[PDB]
Amino acid sequence: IEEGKLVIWINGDKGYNGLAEVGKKFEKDTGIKVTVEHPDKLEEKFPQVAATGDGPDIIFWAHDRFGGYAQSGLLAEITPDKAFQDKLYPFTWDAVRYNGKLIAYPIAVEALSLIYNKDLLPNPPKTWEEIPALDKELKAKGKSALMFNLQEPYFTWPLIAADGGYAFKYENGKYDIKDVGVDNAGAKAGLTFLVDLIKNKHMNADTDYSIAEAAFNKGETAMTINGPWAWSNIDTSKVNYGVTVLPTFKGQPSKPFVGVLSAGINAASPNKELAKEFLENYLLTDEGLEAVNKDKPLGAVALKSYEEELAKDPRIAATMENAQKGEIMPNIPQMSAFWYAVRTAVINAASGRQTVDEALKDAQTNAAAEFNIFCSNPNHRTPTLTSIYCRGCSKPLCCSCALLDSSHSELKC
Ligand SMILES: OC[C@H]1O[C@H](O[C@H]2[C@H](O)[C@@H](O)[C@@H](O)O[C@@H]2CO)[C@H](O)[C@@H](O)[C@@H]1O
Numbered sequence: 001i002e003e004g005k006l007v008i009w010i011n012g013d014k015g016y017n018g019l020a021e022v023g024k025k026f027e028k029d030t031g032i033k034v035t036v037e038h039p040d041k042l043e044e045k046f047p048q049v050a051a052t053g054d055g056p057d058i059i060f061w062a063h064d065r066f067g068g069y070a071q072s073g074l075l076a077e078i079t080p081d082k083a084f085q086d087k088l089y090p091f092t093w094d095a096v097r098y099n100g101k102l103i104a105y106p107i108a109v110e111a112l113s114l115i116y117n118k119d120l121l122p123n124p125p126k127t128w129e130e131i132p133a134l135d136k137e138l139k140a141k142g143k144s145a146l147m148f149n150l151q152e153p154y155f156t157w158p159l160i161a162a163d164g165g166y167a168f169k170y171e172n173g174k175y176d177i178k179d180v181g182v183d184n185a186g187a188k189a190g191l192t193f194l195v196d197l198i199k200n201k202h203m204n205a206d207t208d209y210s211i212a213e214a215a216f217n218k219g220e221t222a223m224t225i226n227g228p229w230a231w232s233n234i235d236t237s238k239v240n241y242g243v244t245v246l247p248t249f250k251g252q253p254s255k256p257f258v259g260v261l262s263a264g265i266n267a268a269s270p271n272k273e274l275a276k277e278f279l280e281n282y283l284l285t286d287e288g289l290e291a292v293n294k295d296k297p298l299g300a301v302a303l304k305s306y307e308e309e310l311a312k313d314p315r316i317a318a319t320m321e322n323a324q325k326g327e328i329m330p331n332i333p334q335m336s337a338f339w340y341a342v343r344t345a346v347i348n349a350a351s352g353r354q355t356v357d358e359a360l361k362d363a364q365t366n367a368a369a370e371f372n373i374f375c376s377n378p379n380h381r382t383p384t385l386t387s388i389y390c391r392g393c394s395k396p397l398c399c400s401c402a403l404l405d406s407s408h409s410e411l412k413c
Pocket residue numbers: 011013043062063064065110152153154155259339
């Protein structure tokens with residue numbers, strides 16, 4: 001890692017051009033060059049190069065992957081004084097706490113929403129159950145009802161979770177990684193409904209991000225499912241669209257996994273103080289987030305002063321409504337094994353390579369095998385085993401401390 005400059009990694013679907021404009025303001029004020037890059041599969045590349053001290057000074061990703069990076073020692077602990085912490089919403093700071101330590105700067109809150117074409121669909125459906133008949137009526141006009149990414153489980157999880165699927169069982173402020181809900185009856189029903197859409201030719205198993213975005217932004221399909229970053233290309237497309245709450249399934253809301261875009265500092269960076277200055281005094285400002293947001297919308301931003309400007313945007317309102325009904329992703333190291341298992345299950349069930357019950361029993365098994373953790377209470381003289389994490393601080397707790405100790409209450413720790 002090169003001394004005296006900053007290298008930044010951020011996903012290709014984010015506003016990397018706007019962040020680069022923030023880096024040029026930084027360079028004009030300090031003389032420090034800032035290089036922004038968007039490598040492919042950066043969330044799998046970063047743990048690989050950082051383990052030997054390579055990679056960027058700063059990495060951006062949703063918060064769910066940062067706990068695994070921190071567990072492996074790849075992320076520096078950040079030290080914002082309390083005056084700066086008061087500038088961001090408390091909700092966002094919780095997402096970046098791992099093992100009781102803050103391990104990243106929260107940037108923005110993201111959640112999936114239903115996006116619809118107002119000209120084709122003045123009244124968007126409230127339920128998943130209405131989409132088949134709605135697709136039948138729109139094909140009689142040369143359009144389709146719904147196209148969204150079927151290749152990434154992030155997009156299909158809201159439906160799978162709607163009727164009772166879960167990653168890890170959350171109970172009184174705590175997760176239990178021994179209790180996985182990927183092959184239960186509520187997850188089977190949601191995936192079975194999705195596979196039925198493809199079987200009855202209302203959707204194609206092959207549909208990915210680029211195909212769905214192209215079909216919606218050209219006026220071919222009435223609805224898509226996507227996050228705030230996708231609004232930039234819709235806005236320049238000529239489509240007259242709205243953003244709204246995801247439809248219900250079996251009378252229960254779709255529950256999107258909520259992400260907090262977060263900026264982590266590489267443990268091996270010799271430019272940590274320059275990185276903190278960049279993130280605190282240039283990015284996490286009204287002007288800094290505005291430049292990023294004007295490139296690709298971030299969603300609801302963590303900095304209160306600027307979110308108060310964005311809040312009147314109806315698309316932000318819908319994003320927040322969906323976030324309320326969904327749930328914050330855990331940042332525990334087991335999250336990436338969960339995502340890998342669900343990705344395979346969904347793709348194989350949608351393609352007909354496996355039945356729904358085959359695919360999800362495999363996902364449950366493969367994930368559980370991947371899921372040796374010890375309780376964080378320092379008064380344990382010997383390492384005390386557990387499979388429970390506190391959600392607020394992402395600390396392991398044994399069954400004894402989880403029940404007997406008053407600390408780590410569901411409300412506050
Ligand atoms: O599909 C699993 C995937 O979901 C999430 O990734 C999101 C990301 O949070 C969004 O910012 C956007 O880039 O879309 C991604 C899905 O393609 C998790 O954050 C990620 O770890 C996980 O692999």
